[PDB]
Amino acid sequence: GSHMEEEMKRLLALSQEHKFPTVPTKSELAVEILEKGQVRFWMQAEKLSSNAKVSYIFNEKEIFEGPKYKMHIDRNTGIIEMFMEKLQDEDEGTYTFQIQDGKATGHSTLVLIGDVYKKLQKEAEFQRQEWIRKQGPHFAEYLSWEVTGESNVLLKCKVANIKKETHIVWYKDEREISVDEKHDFKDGICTLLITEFSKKDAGFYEVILKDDRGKDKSRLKLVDEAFQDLM
């Protein structure tokens, strides 16, 4: 139609322009289930003078910072950070932050109760990506193989941000490809020679990281012998 309203309704939907739930203050107090998959309350609050009060309310009651609800405000204008690490209350979940600075006052409520949270949890899914249990956003070392002229796969990973001893170490499902470790350095990126591979030796070439923490192995499934056969 001439209105083309819906069409723009899509375009604006594409922009994904958020940041609206404010008040006389500057609340953006919404519910962000973090990457770690936890609960997050966050409004802004540009003014912490005298009266300047924020009221943590849960289930129609005013609560306080402590173990179950942790709050952290660094009064740089009054940014309100607040966390919750799960549900485990009496399954209930509803928080109203009413803030006022000086003479102004604003309300902001969040809800995550069993029936409700499960809803936000889907959205959390995007963040729920807890598979990482370590690397998180942006990895450090990565594999990469290349069948060289001799038809061998030249296994090589690539190192990043790390200062302990060496970087990685090639493996193969508990099988340690035992090469000279720290005697001849092998520092930086490491390259080996899969001089022919076999469908009974193939699988995945493991990269292992042990440093000032525990470990860290991440690898893909390598098959070359199946291709060699085609050569």
Side-chain angles (χ1 to χ4, degrees):
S2 46
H3 292 103
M4 66 180 58
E5 188 176 292
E6 55 188 277
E7 297 308 279
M8 73 78 179
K9 257 311 306 302
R10 273 73 180 233
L11 281 291
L12 272 62
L14 159 130
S15 312
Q16 307 179 33
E17 51 182 278
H18 287 126
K19 274 50 187 192
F20 276 88
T22 188
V23 290
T25 320
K26 190 149 186 175
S27 54
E28 195 51 57
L29 183 51
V31 155
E32 183 186 276
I33 301 162
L34 246 315
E35 196 185 70
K36 336 295 157 178
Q38 75 204 270
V39 192
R40 200 203 198 120
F41 313 75
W42 42 287
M43 65 88 58
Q44 200 280 325
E46 43 163 75
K47 193 56 171 300
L48 275 58
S49 47
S50 180
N51 176 29
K53 68 108 63 173
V54 54
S55 322
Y56 311 88
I57 276 56
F58 158 49
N59 203 268
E60 187 189 71
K61 146 224 289 76
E62 289 174 71
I63 72 276
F64 73 127
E65 65 177 85
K68 89 296 191 74
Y69 301 134
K70 305 175 183 178
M71 306 146 202
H72 198 253
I73 321 182
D74 287 279
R75 51 281 304 165
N76 279 91
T77 80
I79 254 312
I80 286 173
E81 288 206 271
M82 183 175 138
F83 309 82
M84 219 297 189
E85 326 176 316
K86 62 189 74 69
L87 296 185
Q88 283 71 324
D89 195 89
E90 304 294 71
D91 190 79
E92 272 66 86
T94 300
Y95 317 87
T96 300
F97 272 65
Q98 82 205 269
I99 300 85
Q100 53 182 270
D101 61 280
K103 185 186 176 183
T105 58
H107 304 87
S108 183
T109 314
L110 312 190
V111 57
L112 31 110
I113 316 208
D115 296 82
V116 185
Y117 201 59
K118 273 53 179 176
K119 179 181 177 177
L120 311 339
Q121 274 291 276
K122 313 197 289 301
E123 295 181 71
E125 188 182 86
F126 189 84
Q127 302 298 152
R128 180 179 190 181
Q129 66 165 142
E130 57 183 80
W131 108 78
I132 71 289
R133 295 158 293 180
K134 264 170 186 179
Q135 322 65 249
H138 303 101
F139 311 84
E141 290 57 63
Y142 301 100
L143 218 64
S144 48
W145 48 257
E146 183 62 82
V147 40
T148 172
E150 191 176 279
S151 304
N152 312 320
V153 273
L154 192 161
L155 269 293
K156 63 168 190 304
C157 71
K158 52 177 177 176
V159 81
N161 31 268
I162 197 61
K163 294 173 57 178
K164 190 68 171 184
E165 41 170 85
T166 187
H167 37 95
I168 77 148
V169 38
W170 345 252
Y171 258 96
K172 204 252 289 300
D173 179 58
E174 300 178 280
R175 306 293 305 245
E176 181 184 284
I177 288 86
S178 304
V179 194
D180 186 279
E181 319 93 281
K182 64 179 186 62
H183 300 78
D184 275 89
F185 293 93
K186 291 77 185 68
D187 187 30
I189 287 75
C190 56
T191 45
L192 278 191
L193 207 68
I194 281 174
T195 56
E196 178 192 275
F197 211 44
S198 179
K199 299 185 300 178
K200 284 187 283 289
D201 185 71
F204 46 87
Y205 213 75
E206 304 229 282
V207 158
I208 322 293
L209 285 302
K210 47 97 196 68
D211 59 288
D212 192 61
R213 301 156 55 244
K215 315 189 187 307
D216 252 308
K217 68 188 196 71
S218 184
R219 43 57 185 160
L220 90 187
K221 58 178 68 182
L222 141 58
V223 188
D224 197 76
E225 52 282 285
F227 302 67
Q228 288 178 30
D229 185 79
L230 320 179
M231 301 305 303

